[PDB]
Amino acid sequence: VYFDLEDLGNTTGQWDLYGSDAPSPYNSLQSKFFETFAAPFTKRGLLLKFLILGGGSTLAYFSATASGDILPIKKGPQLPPQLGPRLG
Amino acid sequence: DIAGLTPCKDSKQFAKREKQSIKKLESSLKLYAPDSAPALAINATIEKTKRRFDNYGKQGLLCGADGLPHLIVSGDQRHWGEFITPGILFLYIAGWIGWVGRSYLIAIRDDKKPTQKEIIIDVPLATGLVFRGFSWPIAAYRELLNGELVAKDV
Amino acid sequence: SHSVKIYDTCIGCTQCVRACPTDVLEMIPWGGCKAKQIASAPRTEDCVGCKRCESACPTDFLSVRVYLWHETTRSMGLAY
Amino acid sequence: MRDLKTYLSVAPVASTLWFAALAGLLIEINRFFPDALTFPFF
Amino acid sequence: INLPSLFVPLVGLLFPAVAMASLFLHVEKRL
Amino acid sequence: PEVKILVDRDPIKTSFEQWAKPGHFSRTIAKGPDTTTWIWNLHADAHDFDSHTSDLEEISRKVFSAHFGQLSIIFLWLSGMYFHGARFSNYEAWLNDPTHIRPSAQVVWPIVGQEILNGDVGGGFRGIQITSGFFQIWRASGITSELQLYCTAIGALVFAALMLFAGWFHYHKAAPKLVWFQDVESMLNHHLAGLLGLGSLSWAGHQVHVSLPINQFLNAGVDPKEIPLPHEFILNRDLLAQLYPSFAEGATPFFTLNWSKYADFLTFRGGLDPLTGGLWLTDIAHHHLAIAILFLIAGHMYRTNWGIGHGIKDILEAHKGPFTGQGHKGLYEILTTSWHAQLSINLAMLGSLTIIVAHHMYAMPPYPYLATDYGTQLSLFTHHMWIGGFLIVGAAAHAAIFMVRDYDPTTRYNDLLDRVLRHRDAIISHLNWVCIFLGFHSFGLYIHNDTMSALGRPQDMFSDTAIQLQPVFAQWIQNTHALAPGTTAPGATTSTSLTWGGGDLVSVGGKVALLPIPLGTADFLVHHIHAFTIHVTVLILLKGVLFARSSRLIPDKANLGFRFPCDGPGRGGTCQVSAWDHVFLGLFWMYNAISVVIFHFSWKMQSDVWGSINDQGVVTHITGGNFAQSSITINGWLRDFLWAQASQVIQSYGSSLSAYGLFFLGAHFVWAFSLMFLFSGRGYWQELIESIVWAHNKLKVAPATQPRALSIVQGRAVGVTHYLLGGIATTWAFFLARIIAVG
Amino acid sequence: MFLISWRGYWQELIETLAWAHERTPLANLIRWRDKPVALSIVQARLVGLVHFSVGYIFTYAAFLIASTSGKFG
Amino acid sequence: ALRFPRFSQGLAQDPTTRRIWFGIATAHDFESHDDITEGRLYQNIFASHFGQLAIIFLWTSGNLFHVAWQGNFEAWVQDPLHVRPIAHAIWDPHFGQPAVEAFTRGGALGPVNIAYSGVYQWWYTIGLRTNEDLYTGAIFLLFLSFI
């Protein structure tokens, strides 16, 4: 018998099968450090606008100032061009 | 001439094609024996080729720069053998078939189980009906004047 | 929810109610036919729209009609 | 025997025979008057 | 200072990025 | 309990009355037609025996006699083959010089100019070059005159009449009852030990007395007319002892157990015969002897009537463990009451067997002068691959039929079937995933390669020159197969095939019979493509079988049958939920997989195997060896395979290969014609037929059997039938024209 | 594909996939907001036809331009 | 409403992915939207026409600007039969060096496309001769798009 109108979640199976609920295994000197230094990146609108505009900044930057060893599109042609079937 | 086409008797290209095909055949021939059955077959084909080209020469067909025969269907009278008289033959035979079929359909339409005579033919009945197509034109004419060909009120 | 409508040409054969897989239809009393019966569709919020009822109706033209309309969870037949 | 006469008039057999005869007729015509492009008679 | 060196990237990379996040947030929003 | 013959007398009476009443078998068809739909149903349900009736006895009687009819047909086809070899062929001249005369056993009448199809096949003869490989069989048989071919044609005709009479007899006069059919132990004992054991024993006998000596004489150079007749070898034995001294002791060894003294003609050589490019006949006879012994022993496993033996029920009930509950208990009751379960298992095994036959016959050529006849080899591999694929797909069809019409946990419960049914969701989930992953990592590599080759970046490709993906295990295994003779097989001289390696190359008439086949990055890519296609086909067919009875979408699907169009447009739309539609979809994917298999084999053989060798010993392959570097992109398949090899067939007009040029185009047409049935639906067609019917009614010429548009399922079936015919025939014409033209 | 395969097959496949996802660890911490479903019938016809004619135009354009431009004559 | 799409309430209450698809493919069928009048339909269509006009002007603006900027026109006017007209430049970071060399033609200083729309012949036929005419026209088209 697995039907109980009082408790519905046990009848429809709302368990956490792998959760733990044990205390923290990262002793506080380590946790202390992280939750001090990693706080300013924890607001939704803040993080999103910052990530978008910073990624765009780095992309426009590294795109405008990439060197020839990287991108053959930058090194240009190095040969005299052919003529077409008639034209050229 | 008509549309610039000159006669196959006077066409040099028509001749060239004939002799090219003939001696290609005869190059394929020079083998197997001078009398074996393959040789006899190949010689029969050669003679048939000559007959074909000469018949197209006799019948006054028109040739172009390709060297092949062309067809004039405009109504000109020098060329009725090309389209109009075989066309009359076709229209006659086709009407024959269709007329016999419609008269069979009509003959069986009053049966209690008409579909039984559609998937299993009544051969003596059809045998009596086949030869009315011989005069299907006159019958169809007097059936049109009768108000009898077109189902009224459809 | 789809729409299901019953028209007065119904002969009250009940074949449509027997066919519904979600129990949309029902027979109700009437006076317009030899059977004194007519179909009704009281539970159209459960109709999946299979038209299994229309395949069963014998009148010409149909006496039950299914008009597909806005879709929901029950209408789409989703078990998740 | 009557049942056989009926069966022989069922649609597939009847059409098979009709077209085999027609095929023989056209084949023999073309074997006698080969390579016809026109009506060369009148 | 190369002009396509800037416009091709951002129209090709960041324009669709911002527009896809934009339209996702809009289209899954219940008012 | 015991096993015996059980038969009824005169169950049905021979009569013509049922011929004149179309659709006697089904009550619905018997009533007669109102619409044209009738005519279609009449043919679709003609052999659906277990739907015409409910009685198992009647279904089994019908099945037995139908099998006799099929065997009679096969005998008639064999009779035709032998008669045509005897009467309209150049077999004797080919027997005289096999590496110059190309075989031909069909001539055409000179009717409308078609005699051009009678081409110069050599030997003073003009006809159609055949590719079934029958001359090779007849030479390996010892046949040397056309009188023997006549004799076998007559014998086959007699056997066909005999089969037809037995088919009539076992249905109308002496029809066995259900208990006779349901005895599977005696049946297996007979087919294992009687059909397969005695069969290969008798055949080993014929090879020891006819094929071996006549082929010894033929390979010695003797004129095929001055060779003694086979029966002489049996009357006079000194003839045999001249070629094989061991035939002087004559069965004394076989009893004195000194089988060593037969090493004359029962060998274990391995490799090919360097004179004819085939397997040693002294190996094949010994093989058949061993196989006959094995089968004759294996046909004594099951208990019939004398206690000793094995009960199948006992074996099945004994097997079970802690993961499978009670498994195998209840399969004997199932496998003896449904014909569809049996048919599914049998079709699966026979299809797999046909594919294995294709591989083994290319890799270790059995007949003499077959390896250098390239057209026959291509034809045989391709034919048998197609047959195997089709049979495997039918296996799925009949598993689905069993699940819909026969599975019944109320009276025949099996545990394993129930458990698979209870986790089908996880099954289909994992198979779906692995097909997606396999498709990304094989076709994706091709797309990467095409894009890197078009972007002028060939050093970033997946190839032998830039980024290597060597199949280490395949190379390791064929290296083990190379070192096998002498180390793990001390009794063998050469290894099983020449594809394994060892540096041995066999030539015949200046042509290459066999040599070691090299495996490289391209082989790795092609094989993973193959794994991908097979996994997808399996997904479709197994999804069709496992969900044939019910789903989360349609929870009572078994009540709608096995072949139904849909369950209406509701629930979102439920077109093609039936299992028949899954078979219909799996046919396209089987076509895809087999087509890629035969393209891979055809290009690889020409590129690295076939060709011509010079007296100095420099092999020139048909294609230049471009498979290693052009097969890795899609553009190389379109350019170097399709465009470059279609030249032979698009240039055959005017030659004796022009029939292939006509069939190329006809097959393209039929393929494109099927798309009309596949892309449309019957509502449009019935509404158009309405107006056409009006026009006929206007002239009192309208038919009484009302014309309808085809069924929904019939539309799908016509579509897939024409699609498969068009595609396969296109490849048929392409292959045959190409291979016949170059050589 | 969209023109020969129709909807029911795909809808059943998708139900299987939804089960698979909801049952797997560390990935069921993510929840879609629209229940996935196969495409519609009319929608499938439209999408198939669009792919068909896009392919049509693109292949013919590529061939026409490359075979005239290659000869330039 | 309270969800995309606004014009259809029946689609907005659809909890499956269908809602999104059909939301896009019904957006310009104004007669099928909730609370549609005759005036709303006509006025919507009028504004839509104006939008399409702006679109066309911006597209032809783009063509003019781009062959005036990355183009070939001036050299083409000197010898229409012996030079290939340029459409625009190629900038693609997935290019390798040989492709870079392969697409550099028409006298350009880097990879380009050859035009086949025929606009050099048409503009040459009606009067435009130097790059300033093409720039002029492009700016005027931008103006007409805005209007």
Ligand code: CLA
């Ligand atoms: C597309 C336009 C067109 C059309 C419609 C025609 C039509 C015709 N042209 Mg013409 N022509 C054309 C363009 C055209 N031409 C052009 C552009 C040129 C310049 C090259 C010519 C040059 C040209 C020439 C030089 C001649 C014609 C002639 C003719 C007539 C020949 C056919 C005939 O004699 O009747 C038909 C012939 C019959 C014997 C009639 C029998 C048909 C039967 C009755 C019908 C069969 C029905 C069925 C079997 C039985 C009935 C059953 C019923 C009771 C239900 C014909 C009416 C010829 C002419 O003047 O005619 C004398 C002619 O000399 N044309």
Ligand code: CLA
């Ligand atoms: C519809 C006309 C049109 C079209 C089809 C193109 C197409 C192209 N442009 Mg161009 N452009 C145009 C108008 C157009 N442009 C106009 C009017 C100007 C100002 C005079 C420019 C200025 C411009 C520059 C400076 C560059 C390009 C570049 C490019 C190429 C790279 C792709 C890209 O980065 O997008 C275009 C990038 C832009 C910044 C264009 C912005 C200006 C237009 C008006 C944006 C229009 C967007 C609009 C809101 C949406 C309209 C709807 C419809 C087009 C879908 C590409 C082939 C790059 C190139 O040459 O590649 C090698 C390059 O760097 N364009």
Ligand code: CLA
């Ligand atoms: C040594 C005994 C023996 C042999 C040789 C065979 C052989 C065969 N059986 Mg069979 N069977 C046997 C015993 C045997 N059976 C027993 C004891 C039972 C159960 C009591 C069955 C029940 C059975 C069934 C239900 C079926 C077969 C079938 C077949 C055919 C399988 C298809 C095939 O491979 O064709 C190979 C073709 C050839 C080898 C050509 C040569 C044919 C020879 C002449 C066969 C003759 C063998 C036969 C037993 C002769 C007895 C008849 C005699 C009284 C006159 C095959 C010829 C299938 C069938 O009947 O197809 C018609 C099938 O449906 N068998």
Ligand code: CLA
């Ligand atoms: C030992 C082999 C075998 C056997 C005995 C059966 C037996 C049976 N099958 Mg089955 N099947 C098989 C193999 C086999 N199948 C294979 C290999 C496949 C995969 C394709 C299938 C797939 C399949 C399906 C999908 C179905 C069956 C069905 C059936 C049942 C009815 C068949 C029928 O009468 O339809 C009538 C037969 C025809 C109408 C003939 C069809 C003609 C084809 C389409 C043309 C082929 C073209 C030809 C080869 C070349 C062209 C010639 C032309 C140009 C002139 C029957 C019990 C049906 C069933 O309902 O089961 C209960 C069912 O629907 N089978």
Ligand SMILES: CCCCCCCCCCCCCCCC(=O)OC[C@H](COP(=O)(O)OC[C@@H](O)CO)OC(=O)CCCCCCCCCCCCCCC
């Ligand atoms: C260069 C710019 C190109 C756009 C020019 C066209 C705009 C001028 C005419 C518009 C008339 C507006 C009519 C009132 C319509 C109106 O403004 O009503 C406001 C609308 C509410 O809809 P309603 O309740 O009015 O619906 C009634 C409808 O029947 C009327 O269409 O809310 C929205 O804005 C939804 C936004 C979805 C936006 C979807 C994104 C679509 C992307 C592309 C959009 C066009 C870009 C084309 C570029 C390729």
Ligand code: SF4
């Ligand atoms: S009738 Fe055709 S389109 Fe409609 S649901 Fe059935 S299969 Fe699909």
